[PDB]
Design an enzyme around this catalytic site. Structure first.
Site, PDB file in Angstrom:
ATOM      1  N   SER A  74       0.851  -1.202   0.000  1.00  0.00           N
ATOM      2  CA  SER A  74       0.000   0.000   0.000  1.00  0.00           C
ATOM      3  C   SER A  74       0.885   1.250   0.000  1.00  0.00           C
ATOM      4  CB  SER A  74      -0.789   0.087   1.304  1.00  0.00           C
ATOM      5  OG  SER A  74      -1.465  -1.146   1.460  1.00  0.00           O
TER       6      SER A  74
ATOM      7  N   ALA B 168     -11.130  -3.394  -6.593  1.00  0.00           N
ATOM      8  CA  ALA B 168      -9.997  -3.413  -7.460  1.00  0.00           C
ATOM      9  C   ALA B 168      -8.863  -4.412  -7.083  1.00  0.00           C
ATOM     10  CB  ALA B 168      -9.395  -1.999  -7.605  1.00  0.00           C
TER      11      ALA B 168
END
Length: 231
Positions: free
Chosen positions: A40, A179
């Site tokens: 991330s 996603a």
């Protein structure tokens, strides 16, 4: 609070505790075919040293390892947290460059030849036909099935309550999770590997559904998840 019957515990490997989410995920971990190490942007856990340690853990335990960094819905999340659209994009661009570069240096250092360890952005899968089929199916089920959708919204609110929230923050977080989801459903289809363990240092918010007994939206029998944390 996991819902299965013989909850695996963590096994210590090269400086990490690896905790497969179900007993079948533990079989996949033991097969050692493939891992996704999701990364991330904007998250200080992914320091240069942690990425190197992960890459060494990965190459010790799997034939092939793909770091995948999230580069979609990042600006949208910053906006939903209160940045202007301009400033959200500035920060997304910056955070996405930083994590791309740290991963790229890691991979060049550990596997100069690109033989076993690769990095790529999550957006690159948008041109992959299996990813696109998984994503569209997921979106269609959410649109068509309000009970399934309500379970996923509860799981989103639980996840946001740890990191209350507005409708916009919930909707963008649902988009962001949708996603990534095809890699949590069927990395073997998308990457053409025999099985794959999708690894993160927190359990995936939809894990309780995707890896559950019963029927509905379920990850492939060749896909697993593990929570991988420093020992």
């Amino acid at each position: 609070f996991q819902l299965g019957r013989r909850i695996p515990e963590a096994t210590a490997q090269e400086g990490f505790l690896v905790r497969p989410f179900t007993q079948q995920c533990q079989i996949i971990h033991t097969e050692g075919d493939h891992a996704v190490i999701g990364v991330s942007p904007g998250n200080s856990y992914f320091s240069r040293q942690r990425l190197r340690d992960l890459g060494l853990w990965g190459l010790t335990n799997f034939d092939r390892v793909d770091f995948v960094y999230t580069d979609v819905h990042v600006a949208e999340s910053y906006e939903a947290l209160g940045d202007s659209a301009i400033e959200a994009r500035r920060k997304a661009v910056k955070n996405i460059r930083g994590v791309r570069a740290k991963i790229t240096t890691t991979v060049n250092e550990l596997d100069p030849a690109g033989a076993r360890l690769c990095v790529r952005p999550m957006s690159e899968f948008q041109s992959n036909e299996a990813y696109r089929e998984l994503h569209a199916d997921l979106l269609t089920r959410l649109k068509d099935d309000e009970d399934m959708r309500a379970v996923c919204q509860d799981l989103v609110r639980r996840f946001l309550s740890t990191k209350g929230a507005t409708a916009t923050q919930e909707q963008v977080c649902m988009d962001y999770i949708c996603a990534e989801a095809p890699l949590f459903l069927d990395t073997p289809a998308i990457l053409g590997v025999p099985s794959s363990l999708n690894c993160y240092h927190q359990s995936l918010p939809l894990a309780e559904m995707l890896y559950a007994r019963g029927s509905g939206l379920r990850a492939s029998r060749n896909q697993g998840h593990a929570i991988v944390t420093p020992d």
